[PDB]
Structures are given as C-alpha cells and as structure tokens.
Amino acid sequence: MEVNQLGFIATALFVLVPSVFLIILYVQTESQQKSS
Amino acid sequence: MEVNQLGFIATALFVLVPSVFLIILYVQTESQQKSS
Amino acid sequence: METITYVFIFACIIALFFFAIFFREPPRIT
Amino acid sequence: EQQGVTVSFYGGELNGQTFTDPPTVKSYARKAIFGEIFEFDTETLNSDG
Amino acid sequence: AELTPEVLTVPLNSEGKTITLTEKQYLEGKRLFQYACASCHVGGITKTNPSLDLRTETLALATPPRDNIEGLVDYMKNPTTYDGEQEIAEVHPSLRSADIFPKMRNLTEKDLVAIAGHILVEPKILGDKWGGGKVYY
Amino acid sequence: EELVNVVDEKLGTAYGEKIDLNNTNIAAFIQYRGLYPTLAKLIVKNAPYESVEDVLNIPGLTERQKQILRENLEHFTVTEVETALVEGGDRYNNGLYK
Amino acid sequence: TLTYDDIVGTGLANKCPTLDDTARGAYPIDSSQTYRIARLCLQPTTFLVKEEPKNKRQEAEFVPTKLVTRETTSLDQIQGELKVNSDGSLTFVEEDGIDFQPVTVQMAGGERIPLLFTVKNLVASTQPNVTSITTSTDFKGEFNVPSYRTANFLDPKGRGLASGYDSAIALPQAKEEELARANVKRFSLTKGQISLNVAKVDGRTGEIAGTFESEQLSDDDMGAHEPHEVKIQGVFYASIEP
Amino acid sequence: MEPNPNRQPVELNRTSLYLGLLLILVLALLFSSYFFN
Amino acid sequence: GATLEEAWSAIPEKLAFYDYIGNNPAKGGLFRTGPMNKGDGIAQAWKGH
Amino acid sequence: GATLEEAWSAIPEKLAFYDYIGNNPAKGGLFRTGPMNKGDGIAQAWKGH
Amino acid sequence: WYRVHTVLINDPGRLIAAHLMHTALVAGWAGSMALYELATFDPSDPVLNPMWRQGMFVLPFMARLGVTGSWSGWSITGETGIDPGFWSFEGVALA
Ligand code: CLA
Ligand code: CLA
Ligand code: CLA
Ligand code: CLA
Ligand SMILES: CCCCCCCCCCCCCCCC(=O)O[C@H](COC(=O)CCCCCCCCCCCC)CO[C@@H]1O[C@@H](CO)[C@H](O)[C@H](O)[C@@H]1O
Ligand code: HEM
Ligand SMILES: CC1=C(\C=C/C(C)=C/C=C/C(C)=C/C=C/C=C(C)/C=C/C=C(C)/C=C/C2=C(C)CCCC2(C)C)C(C)(C)CCC1
Ligand SMILES: CC1=C(\C=C/C(C)=C/C=C\C(C)=C\C=C\C=C(C)\C=C\C=C(C)\C=C\C2=C(C)CCCC2(C)C)C(C)(C)CCC1
Ligand SMILES: CC1=C(\C=C/C(C)=C/C=C\C(C)=C\C=C\C=C(C)\C=C\C=C(C)\C=C\C2=C(C)CCCC2(C)C)C(C)(C)CCC1
C-alpha cells in the first residue's frame, strides 16, 4: 500500500532504543558477580 | 534527491546494532565492581 | 514491511514468552 | 439537474465564467462545502488530500 | 388544552360535511388501532407493503377516496386495493375477512367510526412522522 | 473523452420530473388515482412506449382505464430504456422502501 | 419418486436430469402442432478463462479454473416457446426461469475471477431442417449478459450507481481527475453466445439431454477493470411438450 | 544440573569501545552514502 | 460604484484563503503526520467566490 | 520457403530476450540494490530485430 | 568478545547446542526467505520475466532439484493443471 516510508523506521527504533535500554541495565547486573 | 527511502534504516541501524553491542559488554564491566 | 514488521513484533512476543516460562529465575523460599 | 443548478465565479482566478454542465457544478459545490475554493498544487509535495 | 376538538374535528364523508370527536372516543381509535393494526402500519405505514401509507393525502387520492370516516369504514367492512376493484378481504382482515384473524370479529360501529378517526386525527398531531417510517422518529 | 453517471444524468430530462412509462419503478404510479394496482402492472409488463400515447393501445384495456390513461396522459413521459435502470427487476421492486 | 428430503443436502439438487442411458430415437415435430419445453437445464463441468498475455502475436490461451463458489452453479427451470419456422429448423425462445447464477473461480495464480453464468434472453436455433430432434441436433444462439451487479450495489467506500456516495469521500481535497474510473460507476450490457448439442432423447417423452458451451464475459465491476472472457461447458437437459 | 565451570567472566575495557565505537561509527560515515545511493 | 464582478475582485487573496477550512486547525487528525501543505496541497491560488 | 519479414517471426521471444545485454550479469554494479527489473524496466514484449 | 565463544572448545555439551542452533537459524532463514522470495515472485510470465529477472535468490535453487509446483496453482514451467503435493515452494518453505 501507501505507508509512511519511515513509519517502519520509527517502529524499528522505538523498539530498540527503549528495549536496548534494558538489555543494558540488565546485563551490567549479572556481572555484579563476574559473570557474562 | 531521489535516494533509497531505506538507506536510512539501513544506516542508522548498522550504527546501533554493533555500537549498542559495545555499550553492553562495556557497561556490564564497570558493574564488575558494584557501580553504574 | 508493514507486514514484515507486524510478523516480527509478534514473533518476539513468542520469544519473550518462551523466555519467561523456562528462563524464569526460580522463586526462592527462605 | 432536475432542479438544474449552475455556478458563476465573481472575482478570483476563475472569474467571469459561468459553468452549466451538472458534473462541474456538482464538483464546485462539493469543494464549496470547504468554504472558498482555492487551487492546490498537490503534485510538488505529493499531497494526499 | 393541547388537543383541541377543532383538531379532533375531522371530515367523516366525501361531500365535505364534518363530525367532531371527544377527548374520549379518541383513545379508543388508538387502543383499537394497536389491538387491531399494530402488527403493521405502525406509526402510519404498512409493513406488508411499504409502498402504501395511511397519510391524509394518500387516502384522499385513493379510490374510493378513503380520507373520510365512512371510507375507512367502507374499508374496515370491505377491503379493496388502491384504485377501485379487487376485493382484498381474503387476505387483508376486515369485518368481511371470513372470520379470519378474529382481531376483527368483535368490533362494532362505535369501534370503526373511531379507529378511522384515529387515522385522520394522527397526522394532525404527528406532522407527518405519520407516513414516514425509520427516517423520522 | 469522459464517462458519466448513467442514471442521474437521465435526471436532467423527463424521467426525474414526470413518469417514464419505459423506466420509472412501479410504485411511482401511486402518485395519482386509478392508476396503481392494475394499470401500472400493465404499464410495465408491456414493452416500452416509443411515444407516450402508445399507452392507450395496450391489449386488454376497458374504455374506463383507457379513459384514465388519457386524463393522466399529461403526466406520463418516455425516454430511452436504460439498462442500469431496470435490469434487475428494479422496475418492479427497485430495492428501496419506506 | 424422490422427495425434497431425499436430495436435501445431498449435492445433486444442482445437477440436471440424466436422460436414461440408451435411447437415441428422436422426437418428431408437426408444424400442425406448436411445442414448448417444460424445463431447460444447463449444469456445468468446468470453467475456462482466457489468459490476458502481455505479449501480442502469441494467441490468447484458455486455462482451467477451480469452482470456488460452493456448488450453486446450475440453471434448471427455464422456458420460452419452441417455434418451428417456415424452414425446418426450430427456434426455442425464452421467458421465465433461473438464468442468473453468480459464481467465482480462482485462476491459476492467486487471481479471483467472478462471473454470472447466464442465458437470459436466449435464442435457440436448430439445424436448418429437421423433422425430429435426432441425436446431434443443435441450437447455438445468443443471450444477454447484464452486469454482475445491479444498480444498487455499493462498493467498499460509499460509492455506487442507483444510490451510492457521489465520489471518494475518504480523500477530501485530492484530485479526482484520476480516481474517476471508479468515482462514476456505469452499468454495462453485452451479449454472449451459447450452443447446445444433443446426444440423448426419449421420443415418447421429449427429454433431450446432451452438452453445451457458451462464452460470456467476467465482471465489468462497474467502471472498474476491463472484463475477462469465460468459456463454460457441461451437460444439459430440456424436455419438449405440446 | 550443577552450575557450569567453563563460564568465565566476559571481558571488555572502557577504551576498548573507544577503539571500536570510533571504527564502527566512522566506518558508518563512509559506507553510508553508498547506502543512500 | 462597482459591479458584482468588480466587487469580489476587491476582496484580496489573503482574506479569502482564511475562509478556507483546510486552515482550520480543527480539521486535522492525531496521525496526519505533516505540514498543512501535505494535506490539501500547496495553496496555489483563489478561484474566486 | 520464407520471407525476411517471416524469418525473424520464427525466432521466439524467450530466445530474442536472451541476446539482450540487460540480461547479462556482467553489467551490474555493487550498489544496484535489487532485481534486474528495477534497472531497465519490467520486460513486456520483444520489439523485433 | 574476541574470545567470548571459546567457552565451548571442550565440553561438547553446550557445544552441540551451539551447532544445533546456528543450524536452526540457517533453516530458520530458509523458508523465511522463501516466503519472502515466494511472496514477491510474480509467476504470471516465464518468458520475459523469469525468476532470475526479478532477483530471486532462493527460488532458483528449489526448481533445480525438483520442487517447481506451488500451492498457488502454477509452475515455473508455464503449465497450470498440475501441482506436486506437500512439496511445493510452499511446503518446502514451510518445511
Ligand atoms: C548461531 C549464532 C550464535 C550462537 C549459536 C551463539 C552462541 C553463544 N553465544 Mg553468541 N553471539 C552471536 C551469535 C551466536 N551466539 C552474535 C551474532 C553476537 C554479536 C555479539 C554474539 C555475541 C555474544 C556475546 C557477548 C556472548 C555470546 C555468548 C554466546 C554463548 C552464550 C550465548 C549468548 O551469548 O547469547 C547470545 C547473546 C547475544 C547478546 C547475542 C544474541 C542477541 C544479539 C547479540 C543478536 C541480535 C540482537 C539480539 C539477538 C537481541 C536479543 C538477543 C537475546 C538472545 C539476548 C553461546 C555459545 C556468550 C555467553 O552468553 O556468555 C559469555 C557471551 O558472553 N555471544
Ligand atoms: C558454511 C557456512 C557457514 C559457516 C562456515 C558459518 C560460520 C559462522 N557463523 Mg554463520 N550462518 C550461516 C552459514 C555459515 N556460518 C547461514 C546460512 C546463516 C543464516 C542465513 C548464518 C547465521 C549466523 C549468525 C546469526 C551468526 C553466525 C555466526 C557464525 C560464526 C560463529 C562463530 C564466530 O565467531 O564466527 C566468526 C564471525 C565471522 C566469521 C563474521 C565474518 C563475516 C563478515 C563478512 C561480517 C560481514 C559484515 C556484515 C554483517 C555487514 C553488516 C554489519 C553489521 C552486522 C554490524 C562462524 C564464523 C555467529 C557470528 O559470526 O558471531 C558474531 C553469529 O552470531 N552465523
Ligand atoms: C554414528 C552415527 C551417527 C549419525 C547418523 C550422526 C548424525 C549427526 N550428528 Mg553425530 N555423533 C556421533 C554419531 C552419529 N552422528 C558420534 C559417535 C559422536 C561422538 C563423537 C557424534 C558427535 C556429534 C556432535 C558434537 C554433533 C553431532 C551432530 C550430528 C548431526 C549433524 C547435523 C545433521 O545431521 O544435519 C541435520 C540433521 C538432519 C537433516 C536429520 C536430523 C535427524 C534427527 C537427529 C532425528 C534423531 C535425533 C533425535 C531424535 C535423537 C537422536 C540423536 C542422535 C542419535 C543423533 C547429525 C544428525 C551435530 C552436527 O554436526 O550438526 C548440527 C553436532 O553438533 N554429532
Ligand atoms: C534433512 C535433510 C535435508 C534436505 C533433503 C534438505 C533440502 C533442502 N534444503 Mg535444507 N537444511 C537442512 C537439511 C535438509 N535440507 C539442515 C539440517 C539445515 C540447517 C538448519 C538446512 C538449512 C537450509 C537453508 C538455509 C536452506 C535450505 C534449503 C533446502 C532446499 C534447497 C537447498 C538445496 O538444494 O541443497 C543444496 C545442498 C547441497 C548441494 C549439498 C552441498 C554439501 C556439500 C557439497 C557436501 C559436502 C560433503 C562433505 C565434504 C563430506 C564428503 C563427501 C564424501 C561422499 C566424499 C532443499 C529442499 C534452501 C531452501 O529452502 O530453498 C527453497 C535454503 O535456503 N536448507
Ligand atoms: C577513523 C577512520 C580511520 C580508520 C578507522 C579507525 C578505526 C580503527 C580501529 C580498529 C583497530 C584495529 C582493529 C580493531 C580491533 C580492536 O580494536 O580490538 C579491540 C577494540 O574493540 C573492538 O572493536 C572489539 C571488536 C568488537 C567490534 C563490534 C562491532 C562489530 C558489530 C557486531 C555485530 C553483532 C551482530 C580491543 O582489543 C582488545 O584489547 C584488550 C581487551 O580490551 C585485549 O587485551 C586485547 O588486546 C584485544 O586486542
Ligand atoms: C385495524 C386497523 C387498520 C386500518 C384502519 C387499516 C387501513 C388501511 C388502509 C386505509 C389501507 C389503504 C390506504 C391507502 O392505500 O391509501 C390499508 C392497506 C393495507 N393494509 Fe391495512 N388497516 C388496518 C389493519 C391492517 C392489518 C392488521 C394488516 C395486516 C395484514 C393490514 C394490512 C394491509 C395491507 C397489506 C395493505 C395494502 C393494500 C393493498 O392491498 O394495496 N392492515 N389499510
Ligand atoms: C522474516 C524476516 C527474515 C528474517 C528474520 C526475521 C524476520 C526474524 C526473526 C525472527 C524471529 C524473532 C523469530 C522467531 C522466533 C520465535 C521462536 C523460534 C520461538 C519460539 C517460541 C517457543 C518455542 C515457545 C514457547 C512456548 C510457548 C509460547 C508456551 C508453551 C509452549 C511453547 C514451549 C512452544 C528474512 C531474512 C526472511 C526477511 C526479513 C524479515
Ligand atoms: C528518532 C527518529 C526521529 C528523529 C529523531 C530524534 C529527534 C531523535 C532524537 C534524539 C534524542 C532526543 C536523543 C537524545 C538523547 C539523549 C541525551 C540528551 C542523553 C543523555 C545523557 C546525558 C546528558 C548524559 C551524560 C551527561 C554527562 C556526561 C554528565 C552531565 C552531562 C550529561 C547529562 C549530558 C524521527 C521521530 C524524526 C523519525 C523517527 C526516528
Ligand atoms: C536489518 C535490516 C534489514 C533486514 C534484516 C535482517 C535480515 C535482519 C536480520 C537479522 C538478524 C540476522 C538477526 C540476528 C540474530 C541473531 C541471532 C540469531 C542471535 C543470537 C543468539 C543466540 C543464538 C542466542 C542464544 C541462544 C541460546 C539461548 C542458547 C543456545 C541457542 C542460542 C544460540 C540461540 C535489511 C538489510 C533488509 C534492510 C535494513 C535493515
């Protein structure tokens, strides 16, 4: 159809920026005990 | 111009998937000593 | 696209499910 | 039509003219609902309407 | 002092002579109506055939003109289509109505004289929500 | 080089001001008296009329209906039969009620 | 000998009668007596759509489609005087009868082809000179193809003909000078052809059974997309009578 | 199911990225335009 | 001293254009992602009342 | 027994199409992002030698 | 990271799961590509618009070894009245 060439870019980001935020603070946590 | 409506997503991501990867392995690192 | 996105955001709700039903950090009775 | 309508433009760009053929007159009335009708270049920035 | 008798004052026959109604005899046209016609023509419109309505004009044009008590009475006695012929009592219940859909058996003159009033009385009440169904209301 | 709404263009003519003994849907004959129930059924069950008068001819009429047809003649009219206007038995039940 | 029940839900109530195998003697006509055929019937076997090849000089082809509309594709109970002209040939006309049958098919790709299998108006014409409907007699004649949809059919957004929205309303100020194709929705009318061949009749009765063909066009879909030609065949049956 | 020993800690220093974050982010600038075409 | 025609001629573009709805904030939508021009189009001129 | 005009008519599309350069992978480029069709257009029919 | 995947050089335990996975991301990418390739390969013509025209990278490999029929009802041949069973670019992918 006739979608907003960037609607996808916004969804993709908005699902990484916020999401990654957690795959960041989480990981640093398990390493609170010299682990991956 | 008449670029590739998806040169963006392509770019932007390639500078986030990898990049964020480091911000991840790195971040857990300073937590190797109960820190941010 | 538009559909490719829809099937993706979805297939991760499926991963996110698998992950919290088997990668549940056991609840400790202390 | 059955009541056979007709528009005439006074002032503006289309000024001086009088359209009779139903299609047209039907046309302008519908663009009149929007008030005063103007000419929009939709092409340039690919308007959608 | 809202439904004055000059409004209950309806044309009973063709000739042009008039017979007036009471606040009383009206209710019955109605009470009757609903017992008797409700099924269809509710609000003044035949559901079996939307094409035909109980509007004052309609009746007036009909044949024989049914915009008069005697007329709606004629009908309630002998049922015929718009325009002259084809006695339709073998379908449309009427005092004829060979004992069919008994809703008719009982009634009397006191009754038919009134129901028929109710029909011509209404539009005088309900602007024309009387002939128009669904769209109005 | 342009296409146009077939039906509502006929609305700039007769049909759409009087009665088209060749198109108009049946129940439009309830507009005057002595015409509905029968003559109408007849007015339509008979092929279109190349001239409003041809009504009067119709095999079967009684001098009386033949009468009515004449005094109500001043109201009827005719223009090309229109395929989109009466194909699906729309002549009779034009799909639309009260 | 069989009842509405016997067939109810079966899947044959849509199949024309089988003129008992073994009975090729013909039915004789008069011209002294006028005939008619109680019921004409056209049950189909398979539909065929002409492929619209991009290339030109490599002749259009007729591919087979698959009956998607659940079995509801038959015309049984039609009629219209079977007159004998001052020739020798017979010209069955028509009047009442279930001639229309909206039915769709799914082309080889993903395409959906819908059509209204019909014989409305029909005009049969036997071989120039026959005295009795002998096996292998024929009728090939025309008939009209209305439009898959009357004047009242209203498409997705408002629009239509007899009474639909005027013009694409979802878009207020966009230019309609292109949408037009579907803004105004005109109703089409073309003629298609049929042709019947017999290969079975019971002279005593008049039950002439056989096959048929006919080429009608798909759906014009109002001012939409130029139609598709459809070839349709099957087995049929008509029963003559005084 | 006793824990796993071959699970050493995951190594990465604060300028290790300062080497990579550059390389990738700059690598981006170049190879970008060829994406926009 | 002016004709029905010379009359509207007087009312200038700017004023007419405001009497257009496509310039009523009120007609938008939560997801009409863009400058008015994308919607109705780049207002090119007045066709005349 | 055939004419210069009848001769090539024999040679079928498929075959003529192949002798086209645009169907020669040799002509691409590292950043020609997609199916050959985007490049020279969706091949419709042969124009004739 | 540069050594982060050395945690398996020994115990073929969590080592097979690695291979067991890469190899599910591979066939995971298999059919998924096909649905994609599949979901855009206009079959309508094989003479001026063959799979190899409209860039098709996985499709071509199926045909070669057999699967040429599709549950859509066509075939990379031209023919229209056949259809292998579950082994149509559909199942192959689905598979
Ligand atoms: C076949 C593909 C594959 C397989 C079988 C493995 C298998 C393994 N990886 Mg691994 N990895 C991969 C691809 C793969 N990787 C890729 C493409 C990257 C980019 C970095 C990594 C980065 C990586 C790191 C830093 C580490 C591993 C580790 C490991 C071991 C633990 C698993 C874990 O890390 O989850 C994979 C974790 C990731 C973050 C990669 C998957 C997720 C991202 C990176 C890929 C795409 C985005 C991501 C998937 C979004 C959510 C991912 C989610 C699974 C966390 C295990 C042997 C080690 C381990 O887990 O503990 C030491 C470890 O430290 N991997
Ligand atoms: C014979 C076929 C084959 C072989 C030998 C391999 C081998 C490998 N794969 Mg693999 N893979 C294959 C087919 C194969 N794959 C197929 C068919 C798929 C799906 C279609 C995958 C999907 C896959 C994933 C998701 C991952 C692997 C990974 C790996 C590596 C695991 C260990 C590692 O550290 O790699 C060493 C790493 C390399 C040799 C990478 C070199 C490749 C260069 C050219 C990178 C290209 C840059 C590209 C991404 C541009 C965008 C940049 C952006 C990613 C930031 C290993 C080299 C893992 C990996 O590589 O770790 C990060 C991993 O996460 N594979
Ligand atoms: C002697 C018979 C035998 C057979 C037939 C196999 C077959 C296989 N081995 Mg294997 N292996 C064997 C002996 C065998 N092994 C021995 C003696 C050792 C010890 C040294 C190993 C150590 C080993 C490792 C570490 C790994 C394998 C892997 C594999 C698989 C490779 C991937 C593949 O097959 O493609 C895809 C598979 C198919 C197309 C068919 C799959 C059929 C499955 C397995 C059904 C049966 C599995 C399940 C129900 C239980 C049986 C498991 C087991 C019997 C194989 C393959 C199924 C893996 C591999 O290399 O690739 C992932 C792998 O990582 N093997
Ligand atoms: C179980 C057996 C099996 C079978 C019958 C298939 C069949 C298929 N796969 Mg497949 N696949 C399998 C297992 C299988 N796969 C496994 C276990 C994985 C990992 C998860 C995959 C991952 C995968 C992907 C990503 C894709 C396929 C695809 C396909 C299809 C096209 C690929 C092809 O033509 O093969 C080509 C294979 C070869 C030509 C074999 C080459 C291997 C080398 C040359 C042999 C090396 C031998 C070695 C040196 C030992 C010495 C030999 C000795 C005798 C001397 C085809 C239907 C493609 C597809 O679905 O398209 C429709 C596709 O994209 N597969
Ligand atoms: C600006 C234009 C000029 C040209 C470009 C300039 C940039 C040049 C920088 C490159 C220097 C040499 C090569 C770099 C290697 C290096 O740097 O190595 C690592 C750096 O980080 C790294 O990058 C580690 C590699 C991680 C790259 C992550 C991006 C890849 C995308 C992942 C996608 C996942 C799906 C760190 O080294 C390590 O250093 C210690 C660990 O911190 C160890 O003890 C070892 O010495 C080890 O070598
Ligand atoms: C009991 C009170 C009723 C009254 C006073 C009444 C009155 C009328 C009148 C006056 C007409 C024709 C008027 C015109 O055409 O202008 C008519 C028609 C009709 N009525 Fe009633 N009616 C009554 C009840 C019913 C009921 C209960 C039915 C249920 C079947 C019914 C069915 C019909 C039908 C089908 C017509 C169409 C006439 C035709 O055949 O053309 N009526 N009625
Ligand atoms: C498509 C695509 C692609 C690729 C890729 C992608 C897209 C992605 C992804 C993906 C994903 C993202 C995926 C997935 C996944 C998921 C999974 C694989 C899963 C799972 C899950 C599970 C397994 C589960 C769990 C469970 C539950 C839910 C509950 C209980 C039961 C069970 C256990 C089952 C391609 C290249 C072709 C193209 C582009 C796009
Ligand atoms: C996305 C996108 C877009 C665009 C964009 C944007 C606009 C973005 C943004 C962005 C942003 C919005 C970003 C941000 C950020 C951030 C920040 C800002 C941060 C931070 C932080 C900080 C801050 C840190 C640190 C520090 C230090 C070192 C100490 C003190 C100082 C400081 C705090 C700085 C759009 C929608 C159009 C489309 C889609 C996509
Ligand atoms: C981007 C983009 C695109 C598309 C796409 C794609 C195709 C993507 C992809 C993607 C991908 C390619 C992704 C990936 C990934 C990943 C992975 C795959 C990972 C991982 C990992 C892992 C694996 C983990 C874990 C685990 C566990 C839990 C244990 C064992 C098993 C395993 C290992 C799984 C394009 C170019 C078109 C455009 C631009 C944008």
Look at residues F4, F2, F49 and name the one whose alpha carbon lies nearest to residue F24: F49
Numbered residues of the known binding site of E for heme c: 37, 40-41, 92
Where in the sequence is the domain holding F7, given as residue range(s)?
1-87
Whole-angstrom distance, CA of residue E127 vs CA of residue E130: 7
Atom of ligand 2 nearest to the CA of B17: 55
Whole-angstrom distance, CA of residue F16 vs CA of residue G199: 53
Whether E86 and chain F come into contact, CB under 8 Å, resolves to yes
End-to-end CA distance of chain J: 20
Residues from chain H contacting residue A36 (CB–CB below 8 Å) = 7, 9-10
Residues from chain K contacting residue J36 (CB–CB below 8 Å) = 52-55
Alpha-carbon distances, residue F32 vs E61, F77, G202 (angstroms):
7, 15, 55
Q: Do D49 and G166 touch (CB under 8 A)?
A: no
CB atoms within 10 A of CB E132: 17
Whole-angstrom distance, CA of residue F19 vs CA of residue F36: 13
Provide residues with CB under 6 Å of ligand 3: K 12, 16, 19-20, 23
Pair of tokens at residue E125: 């009440």
- Alpha-carbon torsion, ordered J19, J23, J29, J34, to 10 deg: 170
Residue F78 forms part of a structural domain: yes
Strand E10-11 relative to strand D38-41, pairing: unpaired
Q: Are D11 and I5 in contact (CB under 8 A)?
A: yes
Q: How far is the CA of K3 from the centre of ligand 5 (A)?
A: 13
Atom of ligand 9 nearest to the CA of K20: 31
Helix (H) or strand (E) holding E115: helix E109-125
CB-neighbour burial class of residue G22 (10 A; exposed 0-12, middle 13-18, buried 19+): exposed
Q: Do C2 and A11 touch (CB under 8 A)?
A: no
Q: What is the phi/psi pair of residue E18, to 5°?
A: -120, 145
Whole-angstrom distance, CA of residue A1 vs CA of residue K46: 26
* Residue matched to tokens 């092929």: F47
User: Residue F39: closest CA among chain E residues belongs to which residue?
Assistant: E83
End-to-end CA distance of chain D: 28
User: Residue F68: closest CA among chain E residues belongs to which residue?
Assistant: E83
CB of H23 within 6 A of ligand 5: the answer is: yes
Radius of gyration, CA atoms only, chain F: 14
Strand F76-77 relative to strand F19-20, pairing: parallel
User: Residue G149: closest CA among chain F residues belongs to which residue?
Assistant: F88
CB of K25 within 6 A of ligand 1: the answer is: yes
Q: Give the CATH number of the domain where residue F70 resides.
A: 1.10.150.320
Coil, helix or strand for C17? Answer: helix
Domains of chain E: total: 1
Q: How far is H17 from chain B (nearest CA, A)?
A: 6
Residue F96 forms part of a structural domain: no
Indicate which residue's Cα is closest to atom 6 of ligand 1: K18
**Touch between chain E and chain H (3+ CB pairs, < 8 Å)?**
no
Radius of gyration, CA atoms only, chain A: 16
Q: How far is G162 from chain F (nearest CA, A)?
A: 7
Whole-angstrom distance, CA of residue E59 vs CA of residue E47: 17
Q: What is the phi/psi pair of residue I3, to 5°?
A: -85, 150
Whether G68 and chain K come into contact, CB under 8 Å, resolves to no
User: Residue H32: closest CA among chain J residues belongs to which residue?
Assistant: J31
Radius of gyration, CA atoms only, chain B: 16
Residues from chain G contacting residue I22 (CB–CB below 8 Å) = 173
Look at residues G210, G230, G211, G209 and name the one whose alpha carbon lies nearest to residue G219: G230
Q: Do H25 and B19 touch (CB under 8 A)?
A: yes
Whether F47 and chain D come into contact, CB under 8 Å, resolves to no
Coil, helix or strand for I29? Answer: coil
**Touch between chain K and chain G (3+ CB pairs, < 8 Å)?**
yes
Whole-angstrom distance, CA of residue E64 vs CA of residue E76: 13
Pair of tokens at residue K94: 């689905």
Residue F22 forms part of a structural domain: yes
CB of K25 within 6 A of ligand 9: the answer is: yes
Q: Are F28 and F46 in contact (CB under 8 A)?
A: no
Whether H15 and chain B come into contact, CB under 8 Å, resolves to no
Whole-angstrom distance, CA of residue K83 vs CA of residue K73: 6
Atom of ligand 3 nearest to the CA of K18: 64
Helix axes B17-30, B7-14, angle to 10 degrees: 20
Q: How far is J13 from chain G (nearest CA, A)?
A: 9
Whole-angstrom distance, CA of residue E30 vs CA of residue F31: 28
Neighbours of chain B (3+ CB pairs under 8 A): A, H
> K10-37: string of b/e by CB count within 10 Å (b at 16+)?
eeeeeeeeeeeeeeeeeeeebbeebbeb
Q: Do J33 and H34 touch (CB under 8 A)?
A: no
Broken C–N links (> 2.5 Å) in chain C, after residues? none
Where in the sequence is the domain holding E31, given as residue range(s)?
1-137
Look at residues G218, G196, G217, G220 and name the one whose alpha carbon lies nearest to residue G208: G196
Whole-angstrom distance, CA of residue K49 vs CA of residue A36: 51
Q: Do F98 and E134 touch (CB under 8 A)?
A: yes
Look at residues H25, E6, J28, I14 and name the one whose alpha carbon lies nearest to residue B14: H25
Whether F12 and chain D come into contact, CB under 8 Å, resolves to yes
**DSSP string covering chain G, please?**
---HHHHTTTS-TTS-----SS--PPPB--SSS-BEEEEEEEEEEEEEEEP--SSSSS---EEE-EE-S-S---EE-B---EEE-SSB-EEE---SB----EEEEE-SSS-EEEEE---TT------SB-SB--TT-B---EEEE--SS-SS---SSS--STT--SS--SSSSS--TTTHHHHS-PPP-EEEEEEEEE----TTT-EEEEEEEEEEE---TTTTS---EEEEEEEEEEEEE-
Whole-angstrom distance, CA of residue K11 vs CA of residue E5: 107
Measured over the CA atoms of residue B10, residue B11, residue B12 and residue B17, the dihedral's sign is: positive
Residue F62 forms part of a structural domain: yes
Whole-angstrom distance, CA of residue A33 vs CA of residue B34: 9
Domains of chain F: total: 1
Q: Do H8 and K7 touch (CB under 8 A)?
A: yes
Structure-solving method: X-ray
> H1-37: string of b/e by CB count within 10 Å (b at 16+)?
eeeeeeeeebebeeebbeebbeebeeebeeebeebee
Coil, helix or strand for E10? Answer: strand
Whether G167 and chain D come into contact, CB under 8 Å, resolves to yes
Look at residues E27, E31, E118, E124 and name the one whose alpha carbon lies nearest to residue E69: E118
Q: Give the CATH number of the domain where residue E24 resides.
A: 1.10.760.10
Which ranges of F1-98 would DSSP assign to H, the alpha helix? 7-10, 41-45, 63-71, 83-86
Pair of tokens at residue G12: 């044959």
Residues from chain G contacting residue K73 (CB–CB below 8 Å) = 66, 106-109
Residues from chain F contacting residue G186 (CB–CB below 8 Å) = 3-6, 84
Residue F93 forms part of a structural domain: no
Q: How far is H14 from chain A (nearest CA, A)?
A: 14
Q: How far is the CA of K25 from the centre of ligand 9 (A)?
A: 8
Q: Which domains can be identified in chain G, with CATH numbers?
A: 21-149+186-242 (2.40.160.30), 150-185 (3.30.2050.10)
CB of K25 within 6 A of ligand 2: the answer is: yes
CB-based contacts of H7, cutoff 8 Å, min separation 6? A35, A36, K7
Q: Are E58 and E119 in contact (CB under 8 A)?
A: no
Whole-angstrom distance, CA of residue E34 vs CA of residue E40: 9
Helix, strand, coil content of chain I in percent (nearest 5): 40, 10, 45
Coil, helix or strand for I42? Answer: strand
